[PDB]
Amino acid sequence: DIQMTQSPSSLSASVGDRVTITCRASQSVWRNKFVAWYQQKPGKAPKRLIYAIASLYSGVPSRFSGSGSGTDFTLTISSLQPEDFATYYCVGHYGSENDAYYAFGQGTKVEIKRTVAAPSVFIFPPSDEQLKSGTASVVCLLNNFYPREAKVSWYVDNALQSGNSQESVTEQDSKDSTYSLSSTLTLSKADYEKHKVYACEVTQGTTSVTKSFNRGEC
Amino acid sequence: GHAGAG
Amino acid sequence: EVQLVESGGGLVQPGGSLRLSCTASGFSIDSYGFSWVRQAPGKGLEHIGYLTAGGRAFYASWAKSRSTITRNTNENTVTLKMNSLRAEDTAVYYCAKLGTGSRFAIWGQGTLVTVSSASTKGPSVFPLAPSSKSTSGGTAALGCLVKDYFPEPVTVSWNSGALTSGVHTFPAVLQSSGLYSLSSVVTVPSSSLGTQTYICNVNHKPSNTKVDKKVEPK
Known about the structure:
The complex is a heterotrimer.
Chain A (H helix, E strand, L loop, with lengths): L3 E4 L2 E4 L5 E7 L9 E6 L6 E5 L3 E2 L7 E6 L2 E6 L9 E9 L4 E5 L3 E5 L7 E5 L3 H4 L3 E11 L5 E6 L2 E2 L4 E5 L9 E10 H5 L3 E8 L2 E8 L4
Chain B lengths: L6
Chain C lengths: L2 E6 L2 E2 L5 E8 L8 E6 L5 E7 L5 E3 L7 E6 L4 E6 L8 E7 L8 E2 L3 E5 L8 E5 L10 E11 L5 E4 L8 E3 L3 E2 L5 E10 L9 E6 L4 E6 L4
Parallel strand pairs in C: 2-11
Antiparallel strand pairs in C: 1-3, 3-8, 4-5, 4-9, 5-6, 7-8, 9-10, 9-11, 12-13, 13-17, 14-18, 15-17, 16-17, 18-19
């Protein structure tokens, strides 16, 4: 089929920086000219910034510029601004006189760079209200940290858990540019009351922080 | 100007 | 003046079909060729097919066997039909003139199509209670566990919107049961756990259910 690739998939930059996102199509695009760059922010629909390689649409700041030809194309942001942090997609038109196709790159997420910040770690036992239902949800909160990459591990009586937890991470905060993560360990009420020590370990580089509670002990 | 127009 | 109003979709059973339409306003649907695009939760954009201005439909290799794109000039609409849907077809579907080499670009607002056998049900909101004695330097973390609801989405506020600082509502995860589950937390001064009331307001419009849960300490 037709496939488009962008480089990088993710990049951290600061305000004022110069950003360059490349995009290569597996084959030459329609008329060596039909490529547009889109901008999408969390919870919002994609917004087109550039069309026909280099044409800027009305209202798009001039700091955005597009270049390339045929198979290779590049998005350039001369001076990165706060409103520019988002995911960018290249989309190319293909086909012949008898067929027509489109394809998207995988997207490039532009996040804001900032100083390392350790998470404030909290661990919540399953509420008594829930334990009546027969299921135990243990929740571990990594609050306001950076960078996004973090390894969360659960221990029940110092036994490494696997396959019984799901993770969710927020988008970069508007104010302090940090991330937060929520990991939920799911156990039956029976298994939960069969153990005592519950611990959530957060490893980031050379540091591992483990928050613990003992079932029953307020 | 698009593809698939013969 | 110009708009593209999308409608249809919602819930589809595995093996069932979806039907989405988009009504153009301010212009004629025959004047341009229109694509159909989808974006699965937390994934990139994916092209489905393209209906040329001449009225010829062409599809991505992956969607050709199941997809049919048509238009109705009398009603000024373009329509997408996909049968034999599977769980991985869950996504936000868009109609759009992508405008890769022309000046005119326009998208529908997008509509979520959830492919699942699960039945619509509201969430069970459990408290993530804070301990009265803080073990995090005078700060307390509290929240609500919005668990076992279907389909997306749910909205969460705190104290009827009066509490926004420090709030983190995490993206939902799809549990093995087919139901969704997300957490919403907030950090507050531990000294306010006796003077301040904390209530999370969870709204699940797909089930016409609104849940308010007072989160108490200890």
